[PDB]
């Protein structure tokens, strides 16, 4: 339950084979955000009630390539990080780089939320 077993890994490769149908190995620009919308089962995450982690994962998916493509060896390692408790099961260089990335990406999503709120004030006033 703390780590992804073979049933959850099998569910991830079924949903990867079902979302990538054109058989070359990549996910294109148009369909990177539509990948985690239908993950259910033992990794049940919905559109509501988990919005902060939703926007956090949504910003983690579009930071390492500056948009565009994500490959078959990046996203599963990041979910493998996110699906386990990282406080006592991680080492010092990786934990320190992980908490620095977590702090700077939390600061960046705070900037993004206050920026879209400023946009919302622009459209509300005018």
């Amino acid at each position: 339950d703390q780590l992804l077993s073979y049933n959850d890994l099998r569910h991830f490769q079924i949903i990867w084979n079902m979302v990538d149908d054109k058989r070359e190995g990549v996910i294109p620009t148009f369909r990177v955000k539509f990948l985690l919308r239908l993950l259910r089962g033992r990794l049940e995450v919905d559109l509501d009630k988990d919005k902060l982690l939703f926007k956090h994962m949504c910003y983690e998916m579009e930071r390492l390539h500056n948009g565009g493509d994500v490959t078959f060896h990046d996203v599963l390692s990041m979910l493998s990080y996110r699906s386990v408790d990282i406080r006592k099961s991680l080492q010092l260089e990786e934990l320190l780089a992980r908490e620095q990335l977590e702090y700077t990406i939390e600061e960046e999503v705070a900037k993004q939320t206050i920026r879209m709120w400023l946009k919302k004030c622009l459209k509300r006033i005018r």
Partner: protein, 126 residues
């Protein structure tokens, strides 16, 4: 919704216009290839499908304390030149006329340390 989203999901939803099983074909012409569970999760938030309800489901799929991201000394106020030069300059399209309209709806006090609480209060005056 924005007119980009209105026109986009208009031309997405006017191709297979109600019914139930056409939702997957509209979304398949739109890019995703969902499951039956994802379908029933969309229909379990509210088969009959209309144009603004489809718009809201797609948007769903994708305050005062906010300014404390942009405040550091904790006095409850933020300098007017600093708040202006990070509001209109740090990225997206905030032109000089409409940010002059923002400064005149935000710095009616004019002290030099804009009271963002006063700003938000006038914002919801309606």
């Amino acid at each position: 919704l924005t007119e980009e989203q209105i026109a986009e999901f208009k031309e997405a939803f006017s191709l297979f216009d109600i019914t139930t099983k056409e939702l997957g074909t509209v979304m398949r012409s739109l890019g995703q290839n969902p499951t039956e569970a994802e379908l029933q999760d969309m229909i379990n938030e509210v088969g009959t499908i209309d144009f603004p309800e489809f718009l809201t489901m797609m948007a769903r799929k994708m305050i005062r304390e906010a300014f404390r991201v942009f405040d550091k000394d904790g006095n409850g106020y933020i300098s007017a030149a600093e708040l202006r030069h990070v509001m209109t300059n740090l990225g997206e399209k905030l032109t000089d006329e409409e940010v002059d309209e923002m400064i005149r709806e935000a710095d009616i006090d004019g002290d030099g340390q804009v009271n963002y609480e006063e700003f938000v209060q006038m914002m919801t005056a309606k």
